[PDB]
Amino acid sequence: GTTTGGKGEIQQIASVNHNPDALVLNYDDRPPEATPNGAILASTQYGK
Amino acid sequence: GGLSQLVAYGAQDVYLTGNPQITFFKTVYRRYTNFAIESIQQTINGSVGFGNKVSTQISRNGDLITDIVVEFVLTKGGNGGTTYYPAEELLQDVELEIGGQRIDKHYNDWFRTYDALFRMNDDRYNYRRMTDWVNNELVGAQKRFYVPLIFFFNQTPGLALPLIALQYHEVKLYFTLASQVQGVNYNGSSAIAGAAQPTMSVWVDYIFLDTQERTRFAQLPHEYLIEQLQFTGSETATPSATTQASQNIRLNFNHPTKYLAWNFNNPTNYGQYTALANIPGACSGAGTAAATVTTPDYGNTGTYNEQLAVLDSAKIQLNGQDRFATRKGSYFNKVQPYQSIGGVTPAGVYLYSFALKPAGRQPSGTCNFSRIDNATLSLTYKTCSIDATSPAAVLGNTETVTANTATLLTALNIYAKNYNVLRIMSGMGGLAYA
Amino acid sequence: GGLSQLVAYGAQDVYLTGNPQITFFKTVYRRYTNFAIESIQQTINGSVGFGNKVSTQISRNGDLITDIVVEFVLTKGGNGGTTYYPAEELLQDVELEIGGQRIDKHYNDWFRTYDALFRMNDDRYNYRRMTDWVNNELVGAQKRFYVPLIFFFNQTPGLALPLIALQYHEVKLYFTLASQVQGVNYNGSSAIAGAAQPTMSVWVDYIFLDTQERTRFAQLPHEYLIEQLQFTGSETATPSATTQASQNIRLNFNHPTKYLAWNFNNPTNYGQYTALANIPGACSGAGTAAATVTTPDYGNTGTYNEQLAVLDSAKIQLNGQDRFATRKGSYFNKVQPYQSIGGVTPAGVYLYSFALKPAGRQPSGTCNFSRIDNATLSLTYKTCSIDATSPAAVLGNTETVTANTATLLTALNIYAKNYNVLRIMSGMGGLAYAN
Amino acid sequence: AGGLSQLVAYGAQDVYLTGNPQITFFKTVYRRYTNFAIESIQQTINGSVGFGNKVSTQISRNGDLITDIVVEFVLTKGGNGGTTYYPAEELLQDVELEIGGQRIDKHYNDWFRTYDALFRMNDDRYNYRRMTDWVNNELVGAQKRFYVPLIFFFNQTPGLALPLIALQYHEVKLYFTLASQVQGVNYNGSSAIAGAAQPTMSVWVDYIFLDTQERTRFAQLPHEYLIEQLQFTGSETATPSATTQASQNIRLNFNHPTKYLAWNFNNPTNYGQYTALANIPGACSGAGTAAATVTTPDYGNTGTYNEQLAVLDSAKIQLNGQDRFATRKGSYFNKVQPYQSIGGVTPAGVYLYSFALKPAGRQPSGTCNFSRIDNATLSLTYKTCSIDATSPAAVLGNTETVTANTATLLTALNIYAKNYNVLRIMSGMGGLAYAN
Amino acid sequence: VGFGNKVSTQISRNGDLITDIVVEFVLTKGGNGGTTYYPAEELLQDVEL
Amino acid sequence: FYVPLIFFFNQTPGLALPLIALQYHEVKLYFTLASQVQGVNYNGSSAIA
Amino acid sequence: ATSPAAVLGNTETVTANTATLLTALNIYAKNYNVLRIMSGMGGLAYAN
Amino acid sequence: EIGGQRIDKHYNDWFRTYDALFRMNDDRYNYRRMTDWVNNELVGAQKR
Amino acid sequence: EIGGQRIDKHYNDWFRTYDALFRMNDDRYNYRRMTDWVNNELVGAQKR
């Protein structure tokens, strides 16, 4: 046995088969949309 | 003199002084963008009081927002030592919201956990000074308290929210005030007659920029690397005798995560993370005939004696595969804070990091739970066999047992501190991965 | 094991581990210019004693100057608990001069404020160890003290003062030694017979440079980012009953300012910024029948109970306009040093910063008072109605009141730290701006 | 009004501050890093663990990089409150770091006590204490797990992580010497504590796993690490009881660009005692009462800050017979130098002189290379030990040049040098660039 | 709304021009005749526009 | 009670605030309410129960 | 539990009062994995 | 463990469950002979 | 209101008119359940 010191652990396969990325909604699937801020516009259309 | 060691020069200096790059005695300082900081009161929606909810609508007085400090006025209804961070307990939680999307959510226990881990002796005491009664004050004393908030941009000017470029969003803070705060309107579970309702204001520090930077921030898109807090509470089964109970906690987290931290608390006594015992500072009246181990000596609620800590051992398991060998509870209380923060953590609060320096803002290693199907935290508890009223056992027993009073620490608070990105696009803001 | 996380990466990692730019696990160090540090004594000109003035010139024994430490040897004239930083109150007035041009000027009260405001943890505890008796010592004890100076070139090598570049402009240090030291010459205002005069020595730390860089320092013009202290004394008049004062103290400062800090002191005692009261740490004999609230338990003069302070609220005005909204004294004592310093500021010492990092050296926000004609610090005071001798009232009252002994804090000390630019060329130098 | 006014108040003094801006504070750009995972793995300890035994462990090359290493001890108390003082630290008598059959560094319990005593601060120094001692007045029979971190060159920053992957052809080992006498656990002074249990030890090593691109770089490219080493030999002191202030001229045998020199004056009977014992609070067993005895410390408070219990009056370093700096008083090296160079507090009896601007830092900042110096000496002047240790009137009430009669027990002189060397790694094998 | 509280309002943008603004308070008298003096504005400690 | 405000646009229409022309700003008023108001919640310094 | 007449004489749906002592639940699964060895290194193919 | 990687892990209780399930006849009896005191041995008896 | 412009207003004695006119049996009763004490509750009873 050549192991006077050792060699590091071999990479093994750890796949994703359940849904741990669930509930993660990115800016690409849905982008942000506007809501009011501090500056407000007047009641522009008062009806007839 | 010093010339003697300059003469003492040789081959070994080729790695130190030969062909130099820098000099230590002529610093070149960089010129910075002109800014000024104001601190103004905000508009606080809602009725202020115990158990009530209120909110803050952030004004657009400035260009960037950085430090948010919540101000309270409280009157103490008890004697000295009957309180333990009442300004922090009062602020039961805060949600930060941009355009209807939650960016972060903090809890009173999280603030306590953060101070327990990442604050240090001077700033931790100054924190205590602005959140608690620290000078042996007596009943009827009035004191103004401050609870600085710790969102990703708080105390972090580099991530200040670009309000000038959020002219299409509400930026809001939703606060929940506690229904019971120890020492000011309840003593344990008993109401204090005549207790005064708190007075509240949220103070916000605005950064004002010069002509050119205001243009840059208003017109250009931005990518902000931000922090978030993930949380849900759960119950534990703390063992009585003849057994060391285990519990498998299912972790429910979704972002590159820098660390997992947790504590075990008695929900009836804010900040109590250890068992009560008839030893100095470990319970009300400790050391005297009037000592009781049902009620803490609240001002000394935090301790460092891990024998009063409930956790025996823990490990983090990912997809059924152990991430590291089992550690005893003191590992998470004393070592990871040493390695990862450089400060002292009181008994009852535990930390395991994925990051080399989680206290910093530069990412240094994360665990992406979004690519891990089944992560769990395995907890083994200490047997609660020590009679809490007998110092002979409390200060003199084996590492695997704790006090009979530890069975009251039935709530687990599991936190994950993670990273996310806040995107600013055409004046609109929200998360890159929500 | 950890490989379970190594492989487990996805879309949320592209901004963390995608196309890596840095590694945490291979550092490269920058090589520097060979130098040596040496600490030598300067020749002291003048009679050393209490109330005497003394000067020394920094001899050209090196290329750059960094730290300077003033040495005292004192004998305590009182019993235990009668002193409060004797070494720095003795070091009453330290003036830095280059070629006849004043560069900076520090006071003993600033040294106390700096230690109280910007030093932290073990740094300020050791500072006290170098300046006071901290182990219950008795009358007659002899101790050697070191008061480091905190000028612009004293706190970091990066601004070392290049004497090699100043061969025509003598650099001198002027000292005044206090006529009174609490616990060494006087117990309160009562003289201590037989008190010894101090022994003093000024030590200066020299940097020796390598030939190539030494040559460049001597020949090339230089500019240094230099920090200054501005000060003048003020007076206040805090009321005892039914009223609260409001002062508007004009801020006679004139260069880019990092922060303003101030305190309220009792001129009789050194370092006292709070009221005396019959509670631990605020009264000689506190808690006993012989408790006297005329003088403190001097060894514990500093306290943290802000209701012993006189400042209720303050705001700064620039051009007669508010600079920020009025905040309570606890904001300036607790909240501002928390955000800007991260330390513990004792009661009675107050800070408002203009900078993100006032404790740092890299400029990070200033108020340029050179372009502001009128500025004032507005101070609203507490009513000093509490009987200092009754803990029931001292420890159990409202926000807006303090002890009747608080009215002794009649001296108002407002400090400003600012930037200037130090110009050195052809062996001559001095400040850049003068206003 | 407000900050808007402050921005308008722009003038000539600002061209050196905000004119032609180069940076801002409110748009921080963070760097993207190489993917890695941290895993802490238990090592096997070869040998029988116990008091007076020597054991060793070989680090299994499980990961690619090594950084922190923590020695975990399980100890029980043999005494009551105040009878211990860093029992975990005195047990870790020494640790030898060996890479490929050759020594890189060796630390001693007394060094760990010095490193703790002058470099880390109140906050983590107390946690360090929490990890090494009983700090809650625990009584006889208490069991506690102790964590003694190692402070080798590769664990004070990831940038100096030890790349085992690049050392493919040989082992890295740690040799541990466990003290035979541990105050308050196995011995109480010179008296053995009957029934004392043997320690259990585990050595935890923290591994880093690298991704494909960087793991390859580490395996194939050569490396040059600029690392720290400790140098140490012991000597004996000449501490007089009366009529004189003795001097010694101690010849130094150090050999690399040195960052600093630190020294202790120890009482080998106990652990960590660098000051005299006296009948004043915390200065001896029973202090303040009629039972006070000044031959034995009140161990849990062994460290103090009272300079009058120290024995060093003054010290100077000479190189090849010339003064390196003018003679300084003992308080200079105890308080002024760590103030100037570290920023913490050094307890009485521990002294440091730096050659470095930032000796607690990793980047070189000034060194004295004793490899080019022949006659380098440390000259030490002692205080006369004439004070009666049992009389506070003198212990707390005498002059600078005299100390307690019990001070003559500080007979061991411990001088440490911290220096640079370079650890080079080529073709799977590592080694030091400079010998001696 | 209450004693020692700070409240604010933005003007609801119903109209084109704003002229007067009148603040109403409803108070309960704590004493008999002659015990008050301008309590409505005493209460209105300040207004910042 | 009624407390009219007396700002620059409150007492005469010729100075009426043209909100219609200020569509990029909010206009807001901060109202600070005194903690101690004589005869309704304090009589001198004494609180009215 | 102390009366054989009941312990040895009852219905499917009942057991002894002493059964409440059986407080710990241990569920074990036996599964496959693949152990790979190549050029001197070894490890499991799948981690999950 | 092989190369730092866990391959399997067994508990004392698993050893008994395994015996309780998969061994049969006199192998379980010989097993007990290896693991227990099966001949009414008395206090002080020493066995391999 | 929307933008300061009133859209609608409801009154006491309208809710009773609507409930007494458009809500039918189960949905009118369930509405009562949400707004009244319908179980002969005594003084001191608390409901949401």
3-state secondary structure B314-370: EEEEECCEECCCCEEHHHHHHHHHHHHHCCCCCCCEEEEECCCCCCCCCCCCCEEHH
Chains I and G physically touch (3 or more Cβ atom pairs below 8 Å):
no
Residue B289, CB-side half-sphere exposure with 13 Å CA sphere: 0
Q: Say which of H3, H13, H14 has its CB closest to residue G41.
A: H3
Whether residue A42 and residue E10 make contact (CB cut-off 8 A), yes or no, is: no
Q: Which residues in chain E have Cβ-Cβ distances shorter than 8 Å to F19?
A: 11, 13, 15-18
Cα separation, C199 vs C143, whole angstroms: 11
φ/ψ (deg, to 5) at E38: 45, 50
Chain F closest-CA separation from residue E32 CA (Å): 9
Tell whether A38 is within 8 A of chain E (Cβ): yes
Chain H closest-CA separation from residue G42 CA (Å): 7
Q: Which residues in chain C have Cβ-Cβ distances shorter than 8 Å to H9?
A: none
D:H CB pairs within 8 Å = 5
Cα separation, D319 vs D376, whole angstroms: 4
Tell whether A27 is within 8 A of chain I (Cβ): no
Query: What are chain G's partners, defined as 3 or more CB pairs within 8 angstroms?
Result: A, B, H
Return the structure tokens found at B248.
Answer: 């498998």
Chain A closest-CA separation from residue B50 CA (Å): 29
Q: What Cα–Cα distance (Å) separates residue B77 from each residue in B84, B133, B187, C396, D94? A: 13, 12, 9, 10, 56
Q: Is B311 helix (H, G, I), strand (E, B) or coil?
A: strand
Return the structure tokens found at C129.
Answer: 């160890």
Tell me how far apart the 2 most distant CA atoms of chain G are, in Å: 68
Chain D closest-CA separation from residue B198 CA (Å): 29
Q: What are B422's strand-pairing partners?
A: B224, B431
Q: Which H or E run includes C327?
A: strand C327-328
Return the structure tokens found at C93.
Answer: 């007035």
The experimental method is cryo-EM
Cα separation, D35 vs D209, whole angstroms: 9
φ/ψ (deg, to 5) at G18: -75, -10
Residue C53, CB-side half-sphere exposure with 13 Å CA sphere: 6
Cα separation, D209 vs D328, whole angstroms: 50
DSSP letter for H48, please. -
Give the burial class of F7: count Cβ atoms within 10 A of its Cβ; 0-12 exposed, 13-18 middle, 19 or more buried. middle
Chain E closest-CA separation from residue A47 CA (Å): 13
Neighbours of B139 (CB within 10 A): 16
Chains A and H physically touch (3 or more Cβ atom pairs below 8 Å):
yes
DSSP letter for C332, please. I
Q: Which residues in chain D have Cβ-Cβ distances shorter than 8 Å to B391?
A: 139
Contact yes or no for C427/C167 (Cβ under 8 A)? yes
Q: Say which of F13, F33, F42 has its CB closest to residue E7.
A: F33
- Describe the crossing of helices C121-129 and D122-132 by its angle, rounded to 10 degrees: 100
Neighbours of C297 (CB within 10 A): 18
Cα separation, D72 vs B391, whole angstroms: 27
Q: Is C365 helix (H, G, I), strand (E, B) or coil?
A: coil
| Contacting residues for I40 by C-beta, under 8 A, at least 6 apart | none
**Which residues from B are below 8 Å from G when comparing CB atoms?**
243, 319-321, 373
Contact yes or no for D1/C322 (Cβ under 8 A)? yes
Instruction: Strands of B141-214 (E only): list them.
Output: 142-148, 171-177, 186-187, 190-191, 199-209
**Beta strands across the sheet bearing D36-43:** D36-43, D200-210, D65-76, D143-149
Chains D and C physically touch (3 or more Cβ atom pairs below 8 Å):
yes
Whether residue H3 and residue A12 make contact (CB cut-off 8 A), yes or no, is: no
Q: Which residues in chain D have Cβ-Cβ distances shorter than 8 Å to B8?
A: 319, 368-370, 372-373
Whether residue A27 and residue B430 make contact (CB cut-off 8 A), yes or no, is: yes
Q: Say which of C7, C10, C12 has its CB closest to residue A11.
A: C7
* Conformational region of residue D47, where left means phi above 0, alpha means psi within -120 to 50, and beta covers everything else: left
Cα separation, B85 vs C132, whole angstroms: 33
Q: Amino acid letter at D9?
A: A
Interface test with A, best of I5, I6, I7, I8 (most A CBs within 10 A): I5
Cα separation, D5 vs C375, whole angstroms: 12
| Contacting residues for B92 by C-beta, under 8 A, at least 6 apart | B107, B108, B176, B177, B178
Q: Amino acid letter at C78?
A: G
Cα separation, E29 vs E40, whole angstroms: 11
Q: Which residues in chain H have Cβ-Cβ distances shorter than 8 Å to G42?
A: 2-3
Q: Amino acid letter at B308?
A: L
Q: Amino acid letter at A11?
A: Q
Q: Amino acid letter at C193?
A: A
Cα separation, C318 vs D7, whole angstroms: 11
Helix intervals (H) in chain A: none
Contact yes or no for B405/B388 (Cβ under 8 A)? yes
Chain D closest-CA separation from residue C1 CA (Å): 7
Task: Kindly give the pairing relationship between strand D200-210 and strand D223-236.
Answer: unpaired
Contact yes or no for B183/B82 (Cβ under 8 A)? yes
Chains D and E physically touch (3 or more Cβ atom pairs below 8 Å):
no
- SS3 letters across F7-46: CCCCCCHHHCECHHHCCCCCCEEEEEECCCCECCCEECCE
Chains H and I physically touch (3 or more Cβ atom pairs below 8 Å):
no
Q: Which residues in chain E have Cβ-Cβ distances shorter than 8 Å to B55?
A: none
Q: CA torsion angle for A2, A6, A11, A12 (degrees, to 10)?
A: 80
Neighbours of F34 (CB within 10 A): 18
Chains B and C physically touch (3 or more Cβ atom pairs below 8 Å):
yes
Contact yes or no for B380/D121 (Cβ under 8 A)? no
> Quick one: which of C267, C268, C281, C269 has its CA closest to C413?
C267
Q: Which residues in chain H have Cβ-Cβ distances shorter than 8 Å to A10?
A: 3, 5
Q: Which residues in chain E have Cβ-Cβ distances shorter than 8 Å to I5?
A: 14
Q: Which residues in chain A have Cβ-Cβ distances shorter than 8 Å to D63?
A: 8-9
Whether residue D326 and residue C73 make contact (CB cut-off 8 A), yes or no, is: no
Residue of H nearest to A8 (CA): H3
Tell whether C8 is within 8 A of chain A (Cβ): yes
Cα separation, A32 vs B431, whole angstroms: 8
> Quick one: which of C419, C119, C421, C435 has its CA closest to C258?
C419
Q: What Cα–Cα distance (Å) separates residue C158 from each residue in B26, D170, D339? A: 5, 44, 17
**Which residues from B are below 8 Å from F when comparing CB atoms?**
41, 43, 59-60
Whether residue D2 and residue B331 make contact (CB cut-off 8 A), yes or no, is: no
Return the structure tokens found at B334.
Answer: 């004393």
Residue of D nearest to A10 (CA): D62
| Contacting residues for I9 by C-beta, under 8 A, at least 6 apart | none
| Contacting residues for C215 by C-beta, under 8 A, at least 6 apart | none
Cα separation, C317 vs D31, whole angstroms: 41
Q: Is C14 helix (H, G, I), strand (E, B) or coil?
A: coil
Contact yes or no for D127/B343 (Cβ under 8 A)? yes
Return the structure tokens found at A35.
Answer: 């809501």
Cα separation, D406 vs C222, whole angstroms: 56
| Contacting residues for B301 by C-beta, under 8 A, at least 6 apart | B84, B269, B271, B272
Chain gaps in chain D, named by the residue before each (C–N > 2.5 Å): none
Contact yes or no for C272/C346 (Cβ under 8 A)? no
Q: What Cα–Cα distance (Å) separates residue D380 from each residue in C40, D236, D251, D312, D414? A: 18, 12, 11, 7, 12
Q: DSSP string of C366-387?
A: -EEGGG-S-EEEEEEE-EEEE-
Cα separation, B65 vs B62, whole angstroms: 7
| Contacting residues for B12 by C-beta, under 8 A, at least 6 apart | D256, D257, D369, D371, D420, D434
What is the end-to-end Cα distance of chain B in Å, rounded?
64
Q: CA torsion angle for B102, B47, C339, C257 (degrees, to 10)?
A: 120
| Contacting residues for I46 by C-beta, under 8 A, at least 6 apart | none
| Contacting residues for A35 by C-beta, under 8 A, at least 6 apart | B99, B100, B168, B169, B170
Residue of A nearest to I4 (CA): A43
Contact yes or no for C411/C235 (Cβ under 8 A)? yes
> Quick one: which of C395, C393, C344 has its CA closest to C119?
C344
Q: Which residues in chain B have Cβ-Cβ distances shorter than 8 Å to E8?
A: 43
Task: Kindly give the pairing relationship between strand D402-404 and strand D384-387.
Answer: parallel
DSSP letter for C427, please. T
Q: Which H or E run includes G6?
A: helix G4-7
Helix intervals (H) in C134-190: none
Whether residue I3 and residue A41 make contact (CB cut-off 8 A), yes or no, is: yes
Cα separation, D320 vs B6, whole angstroms: 13
DSSP letter for C166, please. -
Cα separation, D393 vs B326, whole angstroms: 55
Whether residue B423 and residue A27 make contact (CB cut-off 8 A), yes or no, is: yes
Which residue has 């009977």 as its token pair? D269
Which residue has 């663990």 as its token pair? D49
Contact yes or no for D237/D265 (Cβ under 8 A)? yes
Q: Which residues in chain A have Cβ-Cβ distances shorter than 8 Å to E16?
A: 42
Contact yes or no for B285/B339 (Cβ under 8 A)? no
Interface test with E, best of B44, B45, B144, B202 (most E CBs within 10 A): B44
Q: Which residues in chain C have Cβ-Cβ distances shorter than 8 Å to D158?
A: 24-25
- SS3 letters across C47-90: CCCCCCEEEEECCCCCCEEEEEEEEEEEECCCCCCCCCCHHHHH
Q: What Cα–Cα distance (Å) separates residue H43 from each residue in H40, H46, H47? A: 10, 9, 12
> Quick one: which of D143, D136, D146, D148 has its CA closest to D77?
D143
Q: Which residues in chain B have Cβ-Cβ distances shorter than 8 Å to D27?
A: 158, 217, 222
Chain D closest-CA separation from residue C396 CA (Å): 32
Please, what sign has the CA dihedral across residues D275, D307, D119, D281?
positive
Contact yes or no for D252/D200 (Cβ under 8 A)? no
Q: What Cα–Cα distance (Å) separates residue B327 from each residue in B351, B408, B413, C191, G48? A: 12, 23, 19, 64, 22
Contact yes or no for C222/C357 (Cβ under 8 A)? no
Neighbours of B154 (CB within 10 A): 20
> Quick one: which of D88, D19, A8 has its CA closest to B32?
D19
Q: Is C392 helix (H, G, I), strand (E, B) or coil?
A: helix
**Which residues from E are below 8 Å from B when comparing CB atoms?**
4-8
Query: What are chain B's partners, defined as 3 or more CB pairs within 8 angstroms?
Result: A, C, D, E, F, G
Cα separation, C397 vs C389, whole angstroms: 14
A:C CB pairs within 8 Å = 16
Tell me how far apart the 2 most distant CA atoms of chain D are, in Å: 79
- What b/e sequence results for C177-202 when a residue is b if at least 16 CB atoms lie within 10 Å of its CB, and e otherwise? bbebbbbbbbbbeeebeebeebebeb
Q: Say which of C10, C344, C397 has its CB closest to residue B126.
A: C344
∠I40-I41-I42 over CA atoms, to 5°?
120
- SS3 letters across chain D: CHHHHHHHCCCHHHCCCCCCCCECCCCCCCCCECCEEEEEEEECCECCCCCCCEEEEECCCCCCEEEEEEEEEEEECCCCCCCCCCHHHHHEEEEEEEECCEEEEEEEHHHHHHHHHHCCCHHHHHHHHHHHCCCCCCCCCCEEEEEEECCCHHHCCHHHCECHHHHCCCCEEEEEEECCCCECCCEECCEECCCCCCCEEEEEEEEEEECHHHHHHHHHCCEEEEEEEEEEEEEECCCCCCCCCCEEEEECCCCCEEEEEEEEEECCCCCCCCCCCCCCCCCCECCCCCCCECCCCCHHHCCCCCHHHCCEEEEEEEECCEECCCCEEHHHHHHHHHHHHCCCCCCCCEEEEECCCCCCCCCCCCCEEHHHCCCEEEEEEECEEEECCCCHHHHCCCCCCEEEHHHHHCCEEEEEEEEEEEEEEECCEEEECCCC
∠B181-B182-B183 over CA atoms, to 5°?
115
Q: What Cα–Cα distance (Å) separates residue I7 from each residue in A47, D18, D29, I13? A: 11, 53, 49, 19
